């Protein structure tokens, strides 16, 4: 029977210097102190932070400790450095190997509202056939911010995706790209073109429309 | 110091067998489990299988039927099959280092099953497209993409494959205020992405992005001049 691990919380946005505790459940008991830590930064390979549940491998700083039993397992960083922000995994090795979700540790900042902006299709790509019609939410905080489209007030389902930059390194914002694809048909059937915005920064989601023919 | 050295196919179509290998250097074999894990894009890892010196393997027991895992230990080496791959396997594969086997009084085995040191990972992805140059189409700033004093504009790159696209703004001279995001796999098994830029609007100044595709040697260089709305 596979062990399943889920960790808490599931950002944990804290300010450098504070300190980070990450907690690590498991469905089953993991025999003696068989659970481990990694770390993993972006474009980076995960990196072995804390082995037998509470043993440190050569060379992670004093800062990094390891505490738990049975179920309940915890990750602590008593001083948060810089280099700390990144994920974080806790893995069992009692029966077969399994990971917990994993742990983003991000910079934690005042709440900034997303700045809204739309582009229509260019007469290029209208050309080929596909519209495109791009949202852009443009350096907020927090990351979590919804965007839903709004075809002459229709709901879209399944025809869009999107994309969120890493927290910038000056304001620690999140930027976000939502791609709205059409047919040129489909896009010549309809007339408003909604991106609407729900981030915490917002009283309430933000409309940012234009009319196809006059854009 | 024992290194790690990952490399095998980074591109696969539907339903083929995806194979990986990972050399070991500066230590053998012998003496550790060596085991595949795996991460798909913005998402979080999976312990695929481990085998040692021996031949013995083990695999998750959620990827059923599909892991393969062999040992040559002449070239103190370890490779990874993973037949039948599908969309759900386009992933970073990394190779490590699993538990060591330690010798006591009374039992002999293979404990402390974690993972280190670590490969570089090799980034695998699973798409039946071919090599394909993009197109780049402006994202042009109107009064729909302005708001007080500052504008946005930038550019889309659409419907290319393979990974990855470079996109500069006036040759460089552009850096404050750009995100370029991260790529999207499209229904289409094409990769598009959108590189965007935060101006003043007294400026609205020319505007460039460049756009680059190695896989395909494309290089585009497209004006973003304002629209109307």
């Known amino acids: 029977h596979e062990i399943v691990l889920t960790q808490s919380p599931g950002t944990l946005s804290l300010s450098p210097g504070e300190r980070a505790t990450v907690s690590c459940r498991a469905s089953?008991?993991?025999?003696?102190?068989?659970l481990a830590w990694y770390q993993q930064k972006p474009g980076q390979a995960p990196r072995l932070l804390i082995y037998?549940?509470?043993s440190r491998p050569t060379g992670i700083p004093d800062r990094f400790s390891g505490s738990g039993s049975g179920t309940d397992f915890t990750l602590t960083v008593s001083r948060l450095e810089p280099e700390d922000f990144a994920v974080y995994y806790c893995?069992?090795?009692?029966?077969?190997?399994?990971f917990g979700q994993g742990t983003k540790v991000e910079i934690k900042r005042t709440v900034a509202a997303p700045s809204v902006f739309i582009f229509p299709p260019s007469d290029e790509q209208l050309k080929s056939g596909t519209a495109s019609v791009v949202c852009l939410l443009n350096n907020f905080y927090p990351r979590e911010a919804k965007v839903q489209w709004k075809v002459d007030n229709a709901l879209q389902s399944g025809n869009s995706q999107e994309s969120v930059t890493e927290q910038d390194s000056k304001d620690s914002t999140y930027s976000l790209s939502s791609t709205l694809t059409l047919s040129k048909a489909d896009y010549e059937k309809h007339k408003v073109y909604a991106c609407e915005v729900t981030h915490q920064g917002l009283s309430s989601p933000v409309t940012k429309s234009f009319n196809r023919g006059e854009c | 110091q024992v290194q790690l050295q990952q490399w095998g196919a980074g591109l696969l179509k539907p339903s083929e067998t995806l194979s990986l290998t990972c050399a070991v250097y500066g230590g053998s074999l012998s003496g550790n489990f060596w085991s595949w894990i795996r991460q798909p894009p913005g998402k979080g890892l999976e312990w695929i299988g481990e085998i040692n010196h021996s031949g013995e393997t083990n695999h998750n027991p959620s990827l059923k039927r599909r892991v393969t895992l062999s040992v040559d230990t002449s070239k103190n080496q370890f490779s990874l099959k993973l037949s039948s791959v599908t969309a759900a396997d386009t992933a970073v594969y990394y190779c490590?280092?699993?538990?060591?086997?330690?010798?006591?009084?009374?039992?002999?085995?293979?404990?402390?099953?974690?993972?280190?040191?670590w490969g570089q990972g090799t980034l695998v992805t699973v798409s039946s497209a071919s090599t394909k140059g993009p197109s780049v189409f402006p994202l042009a700033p109107s009064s729909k993409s302005t708001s007080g004093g500052t504008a946005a504009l930038g550019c889309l790159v659409k419907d290319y494959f393979p990974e990855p696209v470079t996109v500069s703004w006036n040759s460089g001279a552009l850096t404050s205020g750009v995100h370029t995001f991260p790529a999207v796999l499209q229904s289409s098994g094409l990769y598009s992405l959108s590189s965007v830029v935060t101006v003043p609007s007294s400026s609205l100044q020319t505007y460039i992005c460049n756009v680059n595709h190695k896989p395909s040697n494309t290089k585009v260089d497209k004006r973003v001049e304002p629209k109307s709305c």
């Open positions: 037998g549940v509470s």
């Open positions: 490590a280092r699993g538990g060591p086997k330690v010798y006591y009084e009374y039992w002999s085995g293979y404990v402390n099953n974690c993972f280190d040191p």
């Open positions: 893995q069992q090795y009692g029966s077969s190997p399994t």
């Open positions: 089953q008991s993991v025999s003696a102190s068989n």
